[PDB]
């Protein structure tokens, strides 16, 4: 009865496509035509965080918009004071193959993970004043590519075993397992209300999950290669993805389909990171071509370039107050742009 | 200027000194290597001595030294069959050890395809490969037995002739020499089709009781680093 089920799935897909086409009343490019252009976004490197002696794979800003944590293949997890360039902490890592790092919204914890298939939680605030592994979250059967904190006790992680997970930090077990992706999940972004989150996998699909129920609410398919980055719009009703096809695409949750495409024939290098500004008007994407592009989320016309990295840009983050953008790269430096 | 600012600066200076010392200690005579291959290949048994496990479930690390020079060899074990993503984490290793089961003609084309993707990968273009054509004893047994014909899997073997530069073993059969050098050339044609000059392939015929693999890796890493230095100093 495989043929009958396949036909049922095909007609369901046809119905979904017809519904999306019916809901496709207009286009974002058409509606935003009258919008005044942003202009020329000139961002200059304000500070350069030196101290990493190897390729840099991830970073995450703090909720206070001043402290940020970075990860590298040298085995160090440095918490930086972006205001004064001072290194607040330097956490050695057991495994040098970490691919992600997170900073807890409360600021008391820092997480990291990589090819060890383990998310390690580090207690920044200790009575003895030192940093050490609080707990190690095990259970993923593939490399862990992204982890984001909901609070001091709950963390959502994505892994290369095609599954996202929600963890109970105190208990140390997976409260919820999210399944449905058919490829390695590369990146996960949380909603402003932390009730929903989206993930980008290596099947050119982005899925909306429900944190409490653990079900895939919606699926978005508009990419032609693996998605490497994802980020909710500040409103929380949309998100943007960056894929290996050298293209950013902005999807709407309520409209259930893609809105606008950010690509050009000049760019052929894949995208490694995306992020929005505080207003959501500017979409910043990091590419493999050694620099970044400051897109326009509405007009879809490139409005700036963040050049000044001597290798592939692996990570990119914007402060919660929008004051600064920190981009890390394989040349072992972080640059704060403003 | 403030007391808190001075204390923070002193802490930062101590941190920076600690990282500088750690980096100098870690980068001194230590070369990282990635062991790749299939399950049938004796990748776990390439380097015999110093199989010092440091497994974290995901990666089995082996450390060994030849002549006062330390080598770290990683074996990514606990991952899905898809590898186009986590292979980019190994784009700065000095060399890649590729292990091939020579006697297995069924999966030899799969091994060749894997070798060509690594070779032509964007992030692995500058990394040399130390190709270890394992199970030469079994390959010789297969050639002497003659039950399985390598021409069925590679039709161009009929028109193949043993290279002049071959160095056969004294007790080796000409058919075995032709077969092993045929496999070696199949790999080397792929290597030379797109090698850009920044990386090379170093093939070696090994068995299950070979104890010279560590020395071979030492010598090929020395050659790789010497060629890199010559290229950097515009001497090559």
């Amino acid at each position, epitope marked *: 009865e495989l043929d009958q089920l*396949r036909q049922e799935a095909e007609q369901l*897909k046809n119905q979904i496509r017809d519904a999306r086409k019916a809901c496709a009343d207009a286009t974002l490019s058409q509606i935003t035509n009258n919008i005044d252009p942003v202009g020329r976004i000139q961002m200059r490197t304000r500070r350069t965080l030196r101290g990493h002696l190897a390729k840099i794979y991830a970073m995450h800003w703090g909720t206070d918009s001043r402290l940020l944590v970075s990860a590298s293949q040298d085995g160090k997890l440095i918490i930086w004071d972006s205001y004064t360039t001072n290194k607040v902490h330097a956490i050695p890592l057991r495994s040098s193959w970490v691919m992600t790092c997170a900073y807890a919204p409360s600021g008391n914890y820092v997480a990291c993970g990589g090819l060890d298939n383990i998310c390690s939680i580090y207690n920044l605030k200790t009575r003895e004043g030192n940093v050490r592994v609080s707990r190690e979250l095990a259970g993923h059967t593939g490399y862990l590519s992204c982890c984001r904190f909901l609070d001091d006790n709950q963390i959502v992680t994505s892994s290369g075993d*095609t599954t996202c997970a929600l963890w109970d930090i105190e208990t140390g077990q997976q409260t919820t397992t999210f399944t449905g992706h*058919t*490829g390695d999940v590369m990146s996960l972004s949380l909603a402003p209300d932390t009730r929903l989150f989206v993930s980008g996998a*290596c*099947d*050119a699909s982005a899925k909306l999950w429900d944190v409490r129920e653990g079900m895939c609410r919606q699926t978005f*398919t*508009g*990419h*032609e*290669s*693996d998605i490497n980055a994802i980020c909710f719009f500040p409103n929380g009703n949309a998100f943007a993805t960056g894929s*290996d*096809d*050298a293209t950013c695409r902005l999807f709407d949750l309520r409209a259930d389909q893609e809105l606008m495409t950010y690509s050009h024939d000049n760019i*052929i290098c*894949g995208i490694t990171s995306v992020s929005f500004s505080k207003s959501g008007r500017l979409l910043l994407a990091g590419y493999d071509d050694f620099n970044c592009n400051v897109w326009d989320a509405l007009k879809a016309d490139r409005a700036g370039v963040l050049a000044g990295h001597d290798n592939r840009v692996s990570c990119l983050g914007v402060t919660d107050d929008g004051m600064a953008v920190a981009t890390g790269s394989w040349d072992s430096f972080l640059k704060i742009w403003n | 200027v403030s007391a808190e600012d001075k204390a923070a600066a002193e802490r930062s200076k101590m941190i920076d000194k600690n990282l500088r010392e750690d980096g100098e200690k870690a980068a001194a005579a230590t070369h990282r290597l990635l062991l790749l291959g299939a399950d049938n290949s004796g990748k776990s048994t390439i380097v015999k001595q110093m199989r010092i496990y440091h497994v974290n479930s995901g990666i089995f690390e082996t450390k060994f030294q030849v002549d006062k020079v330390n080598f770290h060899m990683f074996d990514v074990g606990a991952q899905r*069959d*898809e*590898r*186009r993503k986590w*292979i980019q984490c190994f784009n700065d290793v000095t060399a890649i050890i590729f292990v091939v089961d020579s006697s297995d003609y069924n999966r030899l*084309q*799969e091994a060749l*395809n*894997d070798f*060509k*993707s*690594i*070779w*032509n*990968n*964007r992030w692995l273009r500058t990394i040399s490969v130390i190709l270890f054509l394992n199970k030469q004893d079994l390959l010789a047994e297969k050639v002497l037995a003659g039950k399985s014909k390598i021409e*069925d*899997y*590679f*039709p*161009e073997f009929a028109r193949y002739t043993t290279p002049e530069d071959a160095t056969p073993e004294p007790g080796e059969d000409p058919r075995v020499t032709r077969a092993k050098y045929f496999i070696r050339d199949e790999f080397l044609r792929i290597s030379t089709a*797109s090698g850009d000059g920044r990386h090379y392939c170093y093939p070696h015929f090994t068995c299950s009781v070979d104890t010279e693999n560590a020395r071979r890796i030492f010598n090929d890493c020395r050659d790789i680093i010497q060629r890199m230095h010559l290229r950097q100093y515009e001497l090559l």
Partner: nanobody
Framework: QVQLQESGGGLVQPGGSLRLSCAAS????????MNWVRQAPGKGLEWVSD????????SYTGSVKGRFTISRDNAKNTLYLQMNSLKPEDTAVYYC?????????????????????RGQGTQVTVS
């Protein structure tokens, strides 16, 4: 949505011929190298042939070299495989597959168990 719907296949006598097709949609066909993969019963997936973006660089597996001929039609976004002079060892489900990334000569995960950018498959049997 990226999908690769195939066609062709069916019963054929030994020494017969078949022409498999691949309707590619959802992506720029001219940008990606394309492959042909088959899975014999009781065996894993085996790469058969591939063709570059332009169509100049073409390679085949040794067991099918000379007989099979892959051709791509970038205008119509279709991939073909002229399967003439068939043998009973060629009975397999033939999947079309494309390399994960554009503008690349490397194709890591094509014969994977759960590859995403591959077709549903075409049942080819020889009797």
């Amino acid at each position: 949505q990226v999908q690769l719907q195939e066609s062709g296949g069916g019963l054929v006598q030994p020494g017969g011929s078949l022409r498999l097709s691949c309707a590619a949609s959802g992506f720029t066909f001219s940008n990606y190298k394309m492959n042909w993969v088959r899975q014999a019963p009781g065996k894993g997936l085996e790469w058969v042939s591939d063709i570059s973006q332009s169509g100049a660089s073409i390679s085949y597996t040794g067991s099918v070299k000379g007989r099979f001929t892959i051709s791509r039609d970038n205008a119509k976004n279709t991939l073909y495989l002229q399967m003439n002079s068939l043998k009973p060892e060629d009975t397999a489900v033939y999947y079309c597959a494309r390399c994960p990334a554009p503008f690349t000569r490397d194709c890591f995960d094509v014969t994977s168990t759960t590859y995403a950018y591959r077709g549903q498959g075409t049942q080819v049997t020889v009797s």
